[PDB]
Write an enzyme that holds these catalytic residues in place. Sequence first.
Site, PDB file in Angstrom:
ATOM      1  N   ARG A 122       0.839  -1.205   0.000  1.00 17.68           N
ATOM      2  CA  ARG A 122       0.000   0.000   0.000  1.00 17.68           C
ATOM      3  C   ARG A 122       0.881   1.266   0.000  1.00 17.68           C
ATOM      4  O   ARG A 122       0.661   2.149  -0.821  1.00 17.68           O
ATOM      5  CB  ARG A 122      -0.946  -0.011   1.214  1.00 17.68           C
ATOM      6  CG  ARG A 122      -2.123  -0.986   1.068  1.00 17.68           C
ATOM      7  CD  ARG A 122      -2.981  -1.057   2.321  1.00 17.68           C
ATOM      8  NE  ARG A 122      -3.661   0.210   2.594  1.00 17.68           N
ATOM      9  CZ  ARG A 122      -4.439   0.447   3.647  1.00 17.68           C
ATOM     10  NH1 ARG A 122      -4.657  -0.502   4.547  1.00 17.68           N
ATOM     11  NH2 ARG A 122      -5.020   1.628   3.796  1.00 17.68           N
ATOM     12  N   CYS A 172      -1.427   6.529   8.562  1.00 16.87           N
ATOM     13  CA  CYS A 172      -1.777   5.237   7.944  1.00 16.87           C
ATOM     14  C   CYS A 172      -2.872   5.462   6.893  1.00 16.87           C
ATOM     15  O   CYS A 172      -2.874   6.515   6.242  1.00 16.87           O
ATOM     16  CB  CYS A 172      -2.166   4.180   8.977  1.00 16.87           C
ATOM     17  SG  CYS A 172      -3.486   4.681  10.113  1.00 16.87           S
TER      18      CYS A 172
END
Length: 278
Positions: free
Chosen positions: A179, A239
């Site tokens: 990611r 995040c």
Amino acid sequence: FQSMVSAQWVAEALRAPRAGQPLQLLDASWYLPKRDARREFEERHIPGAAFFDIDQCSDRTSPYDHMLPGAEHFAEYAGRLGVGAATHVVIYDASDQGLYSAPRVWWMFRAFGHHAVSLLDGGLRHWLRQNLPSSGKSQPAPAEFRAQLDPAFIKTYEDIKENLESRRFQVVDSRATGRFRGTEPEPRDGIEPGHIPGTVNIPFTDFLSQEGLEKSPEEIRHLFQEKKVDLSKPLVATCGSGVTACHVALGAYLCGKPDVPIYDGSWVEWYMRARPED
Ligand code: NA
């Protein structure tokens, strides 16, 4: 001081108690669409535990999910959940990693002024291996909870944006490597993977054992050093959506650094507002 509690500590403190120092267990299980945290709680949970809904106890106006709520909203929520002035909160989750969404709620109580908050090591994953002390729903009584949010716990889009120039704080992203690198998709429709320039990838899984327990403070110190993070200099965690970033804040907390703000908006807000084109 004293931010984490073991699977054995909680077993004793319930069969206590003490006088003017109550306990309150919380199941702050939260998953990405893939599992029903509230139905799973009602099937299997720890005695006395009430379910903490991360998306419910959130800002009611933002188009982003699980943004920190207002002071009055968190007071009404934590209160109705069995949290007062002298209460000692212990948060866990039935995650496969052991702990995942639980540090987010640990960080939330700290930010609103209630520092009498701890976390259960290994969560429910290890509340299985170590004995089996329940079903139902849950029923705690109220509060008179007071909340005063300290904005020093949160960083905004503008703070991250302006830090790109000032470099006043280090930024650690706790997302999976794929990611962060932009090689694995983002779990949200229309959001592309990738990372904020000049941030360090320290996936939240690097803070935990394969057993699911929290790594030793010396192991976490070694990790921060190996990833090129200076715990003597300012640090902010980010995040996907501000959940697992709190694992970084927890890691630094167990190393003696409690001032680790969280970029609540995280990657989803950054992708939306900065619009990286690749
Ligand atoms: Na509501």
